[PDB]
Design an enzyme around this catalytic site. Structure first.
Site, PDB file in Angstrom:
ATOM      1  N   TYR A   1      -7.015 -12.375   5.648  1.00  0.00           N
ATOM      2  CA  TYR A   1      -5.827 -13.139   5.321  1.00  0.00           C
ATOM      3  C   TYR A   1      -5.327 -13.967   6.511  1.00  0.00           C
ATOM      4  O   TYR A   1      -5.287 -13.499   7.636  1.00  0.00           O
ATOM      5  CB  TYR A   1      -4.669 -12.205   4.970  1.00  0.00           C
ATOM      6  CG  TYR A   1      -4.763 -11.414   3.674  1.00  0.00           C
ATOM      7  CD1 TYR A   1      -4.050 -11.817   2.530  1.00  0.00           C
ATOM      8  CD2 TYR A   1      -5.487 -10.207   3.621  1.00  0.00           C
ATOM      9  CE1 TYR A   1      -4.109 -11.073   1.350  1.00  0.00           C
ATOM     10  CE2 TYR A   1      -5.557  -9.472   2.462  1.00  0.00           C
ATOM     11  CZ  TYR A   1      -4.853  -9.893   1.325  1.00  0.00           C
ATOM     12  OH  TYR A   1      -4.898  -9.118   0.184  1.00  0.00           O
TER      13      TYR A   1
ATOM     14  N   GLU B   1     -12.248  -8.096   4.227  1.00  0.00           N
ATOM     15  CA  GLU B   1     -11.266  -8.869   3.480  1.00  0.00           C
ATOM     16  C   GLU B   1     -10.258  -9.370   4.514  1.00  0.00           C
ATOM     17  O   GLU B   1      -9.595  -8.565   5.217  1.00  0.00           O
ATOM     18  CB  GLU B   1     -10.598  -7.978   2.412  1.00  0.00           C
ATOM     19  CG  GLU B   1      -9.647  -8.718   1.451  1.00  0.00           C
ATOM     20  CD  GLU B   1      -8.965  -7.751   0.509  1.00  0.00           C
ATOM     21  OE1 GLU B   1      -8.675  -6.608   0.970  1.00  0.00           O
ATOM     22  OE2 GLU B   1      -8.757  -8.110  -0.677  1.00  0.00           O
TER      23      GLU B   1
ATOM     24  N   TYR C   1      -7.387 -16.612   2.200  1.00  0.00           N
ATOM     25  CA  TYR C   1      -7.915 -15.310   1.839  1.00  0.00           C
ATOM     26  C   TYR C   1      -9.403 -15.444   1.539  1.00  0.00           C
ATOM     27  O   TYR C   1      -9.813 -16.402   0.851  1.00  0.00           O
ATOM     28  CB  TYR C   1      -7.144 -14.823   0.618  1.00  0.00           C
ATOM     29  CG  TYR C   1      -7.680 -13.617  -0.062  1.00  0.00           C
ATOM     30  CD1 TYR C   1      -7.406 -12.342   0.430  1.00  0.00           C
ATOM     31  CD2 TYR C   1      -8.464 -13.744  -1.205  1.00  0.00           C
ATOM     32  CE1 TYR C   1      -7.922 -11.195  -0.199  1.00  0.00           C
ATOM     33  CE2 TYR C   1      -8.962 -12.608  -1.873  1.00  0.00           C
ATOM     34  CZ  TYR C   1      -8.679 -11.339  -1.355  1.00  0.00           C
ATOM     35  OH  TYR C   1      -9.149 -10.209  -1.993  1.00  0.00           O
TER      36      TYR C   1
ATOM     37  N   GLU D   1      -0.832 -14.086  -3.969  1.00  0.00           N
ATOM     38  CA  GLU D   1      -0.935 -12.659  -4.264  1.00  0.00           C
ATOM     39  C   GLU D   1       0.459 -12.119  -4.684  1.00  0.00           C
ATOM     40  O   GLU D   1       1.477 -12.484  -4.085  1.00  0.00           O
ATOM     41  CB  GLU D   1      -1.562 -11.879  -3.092  1.00  0.00           C
ATOM     42  CG  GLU D   1      -1.460 -10.365  -3.235  1.00  0.00           C
ATOM     43  CD  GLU D   1      -2.472  -9.542  -2.445  1.00  0.00           C
ATOM     44  OE1 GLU D   1      -3.231 -10.091  -1.614  1.00  0.00           O
ATOM     45  OE2 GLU D   1      -2.507  -8.299  -2.667  1.00  0.00           O
TER      46      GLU D   1
ATOM     47  N   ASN E   1      -0.923  -5.742  -9.487  1.00  0.00           N
ATOM     48  CA  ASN E   1      -1.433  -6.518  -8.344  1.00  0.00           C
ATOM     49  C   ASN E   1      -2.388  -7.608  -8.839  1.00  0.00           C
ATOM     50  O   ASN E   1      -3.153  -7.378  -9.751  1.00  0.00           O
ATOM     51  CB  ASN E   1      -2.111  -5.569  -7.351  1.00  0.00           C
ATOM     52  CG  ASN E   1      -2.547  -6.242  -6.028  1.00  0.00           C
ATOM     53  OD1 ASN E   1      -1.844  -7.084  -5.420  1.00  0.00           O
ATOM     54  ND2 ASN E   1      -3.717  -5.831  -5.568  1.00  0.00           N
TER      55      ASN E   1
END
Length: 195
Positions: free
Chosen positions: A89, A87, A78, A179, A46
Protein backbone atom coordinates in the site's frame (compact mmCIF):
# COMPACT_ATOMS: atom_id res chain seq x y z
CA UNK A 1 -20.14 1.85 -18.17
CA UNK A 2 -19.90 -1.63 -16.66
CA UNK A 3 -21.12 -1.99 -13.08
CA UNK A 4 -20.11 -5.02 -11.00
CA UNK A 5 -21.37 -6.13 -7.59
CA UNK A 6 -19.20 -9.13 -6.90
CA UNK A 7 -15.50 -10.10 -7.14
CA UNK A 8 -13.89 -9.81 -10.53
CA UNK A 9 -10.57 -9.06 -12.23
CA UNK A 10 -10.30 -8.12 -15.90
CA UNK A 11 -9.58 -5.39 -18.33
CA UNK A 12 -11.53 -2.30 -19.18
CA UNK A 13 -10.83 0.45 -21.74
CA UNK A 14 -7.08 -0.39 -21.86
CA UNK A 15 -6.75 -0.73 -18.08
CA UNK A 16 -6.50 -3.68 -15.73
CA UNK A 17 -8.91 -3.80 -12.77
CA UNK A 18 -9.27 -5.92 -9.66
CA UNK A 19 -12.38 -5.80 -7.44
CA UNK A 20 -12.81 -8.02 -4.41
CA UNK A 21 -15.40 -8.22 -1.59
CA UNK A 22 -16.39 -10.84 1.01
CA UNK A 23 -20.09 -11.73 1.29
CA UNK A 24 -21.73 -8.98 3.42
CA UNK A 25 -23.28 -5.81 2.02
CA UNK A 26 -23.22 -4.10 -1.39
CA UNK A 27 -20.42 -2.67 -3.57
CA UNK A 28 -21.39 -0.98 -6.78
CA UNK A 29 -18.04 -0.98 -8.59
CA UNK A 30 -18.49 0.72 -11.96
CA UNK A 31 -15.93 0.77 -14.74
CA UNK A 32 -15.96 4.05 -16.75
CA UNK A 33 -14.01 5.39 -19.70
CA UNK A 34 -10.19 5.43 -19.73
CA UNK A 35 -8.57 4.86 -16.30
CA UNK A 36 -11.70 5.87 -14.38
CA UNK A 37 -13.78 3.81 -11.96
CA UNK A 38 -16.36 4.62 -9.33
CA UNK A 39 -17.36 2.83 -6.17
CA UNK A 40 -19.93 3.02 -3.45
CA UNK A 41 -20.21 0.57 -0.58
CA UNK A 42 -22.75 -0.15 2.19
CA UNK A 43 -23.02 -2.66 5.08
CA UNK A 44 -19.90 -4.40 3.81
CA UNK A 45 -17.34 -6.36 5.83
CA UNK A 46 -14.27 -5.76 3.60
CA UNK A 47 -13.69 -4.84 -0.07
CA UNK A 48 -10.83 -3.50 -2.22
CA UNK A 49 -10.81 -2.57 -5.88
CA UNK A 50 -9.57 -0.24 -8.57
CA UNK A 51 -7.94 0.26 -11.96
CA UNK A 52 -4.31 0.04 -12.94
CA UNK A 53 -1.96 -2.54 -14.38
CA UNK A 54 -1.80 -6.33 -14.66
CA UNK A 55 1.94 -6.12 -13.96
CA UNK A 56 3.24 -3.54 -11.59
CA UNK A 57 6.45 -1.57 -12.19
CA UNK A 58 8.36 1.58 -11.13
CA UNK A 59 5.92 3.64 -13.30
CA UNK A 60 4.82 6.99 -11.82
CA UNK A 61 1.09 6.75 -11.07
CA UNK A 62 -1.14 9.85 -11.23
CA UNK A 63 -4.72 9.87 -9.89
CA UNK A 64 -7.56 12.35 -9.21
CA UNK A 65 -11.16 12.46 -7.99
CA UNK A 66 -13.17 12.01 -4.81
CA UNK A 67 -13.02 9.72 -1.79
CA UNK A 68 -15.69 9.83 0.91
CA UNK A 69 -15.23 7.51 3.88
CA UNK A 70 -16.87 8.66 7.14
CA UNK A 71 -15.88 5.32 8.64
CA UNK A 72 -13.02 2.93 7.93
CA UNK A 73 -11.74 3.16 4.34
CA UNK A 74 -8.50 3.76 2.40
CA UNK A 75 -7.46 5.40 -0.84
CA UNK A 76 -4.15 3.80 -1.81
CA UNK A 77 -1.88 2.53 -4.48
CA UNK A 78 -2.18 -1.20 -3.87
CA UNK A 79 -0.55 -4.29 -5.39
CA UNK A 80 1.23 -7.60 -4.97
CA UNK A 81 4.52 -9.32 -5.62
CA UNK A 82 5.39 -12.98 -5.49
CA UNK A 83 8.59 -14.62 -4.24
CA UNK A 84 8.22 -13.06 -1.59
CA UNK A 85 4.43 -12.89 -1.50
CA UNK A 86 3.84 -9.23 -0.59
CA UNK A 87 0.70 -7.11 -0.38
CA UNK A 88 1.66 -3.43 -0.50
CA UNK A 89 0.00 0.00 0.00
CA UNK A 90 0.91 3.61 -0.53
CA UNK A 91 -1.92 5.17 1.43
CA UNK A 92 -2.82 8.80 0.51
CA UNK A 93 -6.08 9.08 2.37
CA UNK A 94 -8.15 7.16 4.87
CA UNK A 95 -11.43 7.51 6.80
CA UNK A 96 -12.01 6.97 10.51
CA UNK A 97 -8.94 4.81 11.19
CA UNK A 98 -5.33 5.52 10.15
CA UNK A 99 -3.68 2.33 8.88
CA UNK A 100 -2.00 -0.14 9.48
CA UNK A 101 -2.74 0.03 13.22
CA UNK A 102 -1.01 -1.74 16.10
CA UNK A 103 -0.25 -4.78 13.87
CA UNK A 104 2.20 -2.50 11.99
CA UNK A 105 5.89 -2.15 12.81
CA UNK A 106 7.19 1.40 12.24
CA UNK A 107 10.45 1.38 10.16
CA UNK A 108 10.97 5.05 9.27
CA UNK A 109 9.72 7.65 6.77
CA UNK A 110 10.08 8.53 3.07
CA UNK A 111 9.48 11.95 1.45
CA UNK A 112 7.73 11.65 -1.91
CA UNK A 113 5.42 13.74 -4.09
CA UNK A 114 5.39 16.65 -1.59
CA UNK A 115 4.34 14.39 1.31
CA UNK A 116 6.02 12.48 4.12
CA UNK A 117 4.90 8.88 4.60
CA UNK A 118 5.35 6.55 7.57
CA UNK A 119 6.73 3.09 6.57
CA UNK A 120 5.29 0.00 8.28
CA UNK A 121 5.68 -3.76 7.92
CA UNK A 122 2.84 -6.06 9.05
CA UNK A 123 2.27 -9.77 8.73
CA UNK A 124 -0.72 -11.82 7.63
CA UNK A 125 -0.49 -15.46 8.79
CA UNK A 126 -3.06 -17.76 7.15
CA UNK A 127 -4.74 -15.26 4.97
CA UNK A 128 -6.37 -15.06 1.49
CA UNK A 129 -4.00 -13.80 -1.19
CA UNK A 130 -3.42 -13.76 -4.93
CA UNK A 131 -2.11 -17.35 -4.56
CA UNK A 132 -4.67 -18.51 -1.97
CA UNK A 133 -4.17 -19.16 1.72
CA UNK A 134 -0.73 -17.97 2.72
CA UNK A 135 1.47 -16.12 5.16
CA UNK A 136 2.79 -12.89 3.80
CA UNK A 137 4.23 -9.55 4.83
CA UNK A 138 2.51 -6.28 4.03
CA UNK A 139 4.49 -3.08 3.21
CA UNK A 140 2.90 0.27 4.01
CA UNK A 141 3.70 3.86 3.18
CA UNK A 142 1.03 5.95 4.94
CA UNK A 143 0.92 9.74 4.38
CA UNK A 144 1.23 11.79 7.57
CA UNK A 145 -1.79 13.99 6.53
CA UNK A 146 -4.59 12.94 4.11
CA UNK A 147 -4.68 13.85 0.44
CA UNK A 148 -7.03 12.96 -2.39
CA UNK A 149 -5.21 13.55 -5.71
CA UNK A 150 -1.70 13.61 -6.99
CA UNK A 151 1.22 11.61 -8.39
CA UNK A 152 2.72 8.57 -6.60
CA UNK A 153 6.39 8.12 -7.57
CA UNK A 154 6.48 4.36 -6.89
CA UNK A 155 10.27 4.16 -7.21
CA UNK A 156 10.69 6.48 -4.13
CA UNK A 157 8.53 4.15 -1.98
CA UNK A 158 10.06 0.96 -3.45
CA UNK A 159 13.59 2.36 -2.83
CA UNK A 160 12.72 3.46 0.75
CA UNK A 161 11.09 0.10 1.57
CA UNK A 162 14.23 -1.64 0.19
CA UNK A 163 16.54 0.51 2.46
CA UNK A 164 14.60 -0.84 5.47
CA UNK A 165 14.79 -4.47 4.43
CA UNK A 166 11.39 -4.76 2.78
CA UNK A 167 12.06 -6.74 -0.38
CA UNK A 168 9.74 -6.60 -3.37
CA UNK A 169 9.35 -9.78 -5.45
CA UNK A 170 8.12 -10.40 -9.04
CA UNK A 171 5.29 -7.84 -9.54
CA UNK A 172 1.74 -8.96 -9.96
CA UNK A 173 -1.03 -6.35 -10.28
CA UNK A 174 -0.80 -2.70 -9.25
CA UNK A 175 -3.92 -0.56 -8.90
CA UNK A 176 -5.16 2.73 -7.47
CA UNK A 177 -7.46 1.15 -4.98
CA UNK A 178 -10.36 2.05 -2.75
CA UNK A 179 -10.77 -0.11 0.38
CA UNK A 180 -13.67 -0.19 2.89
CA UNK A 181 -13.89 -1.98 6.21
CA UNK A 182 -17.18 -2.46 8.09
CA UNK A 183 -18.40 0.88 6.76
CA UNK A 184 -20.14 2.69 3.90
CA UNK A 185 -18.74 5.26 1.50
CA UNK A 186 -17.89 6.14 -2.09
CA UNK A 187 -15.05 7.07 -4.49
CA UNK A 188 -14.52 8.20 -8.03
CA UNK A 189 -10.93 7.74 -9.14
CA UNK A 190 -9.13 8.20 -12.50
CA UNK A 191 -5.68 6.61 -12.87
CA UNK A 192 -2.93 7.06 -15.44
CA UNK A 193 0.80 6.97 -15.83
CA UNK A 194 1.23 10.11 -17.98
CA UNK A 195 1.13 12.68 -15.18
Amino acid sequence: QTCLTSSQTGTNNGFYYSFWKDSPGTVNFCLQSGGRYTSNWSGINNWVGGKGWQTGSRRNITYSGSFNSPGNGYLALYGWTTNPLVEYYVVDSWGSWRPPGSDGTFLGTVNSDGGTYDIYRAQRVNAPSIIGNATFYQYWSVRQSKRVGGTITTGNHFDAWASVGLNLGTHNYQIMATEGYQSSGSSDITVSEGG
